[PDB]
Amino acid sequence: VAVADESLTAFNDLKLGKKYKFILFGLNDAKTEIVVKETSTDPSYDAFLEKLPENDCLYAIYDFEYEINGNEGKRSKIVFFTWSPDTAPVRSKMVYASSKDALRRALNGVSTDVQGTDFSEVSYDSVLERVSR
Q1: Topology adopted by domain 1-133
Q2: Going by C-beta distance under 8 Å and a sequence separation of 6 or more, which residues neighbour residue 126?
């Protein structure tokens, strides 16, 4: 579909400005474009997970910061999440699956990509392992 202008601006603020810790994107009612549904500066990973619709899909961008060690500080990588819970309607999964690339191709700067179908696939530990290793 079309990527709302607002969605790009929000990605750039997070990317160059650290303005938000994470952003939740979704399709509008008209299913014509990808808009931002929520933004947050809340650093707790649990506040992120509590916002993933148990029976629906969405796209998410999270600024994951972790310790690159050797007493060397932290590192931060932008993770793109595709959230398609096993319990979401086949109709939802279908439309999110095909519109994904429209959004994913427009966001320059993403390090990792995570496909989430259940909550354990998006736990702090699974994502840490994926950005670390």
Answers
A1: Severin (3.40.20)
A2: 120
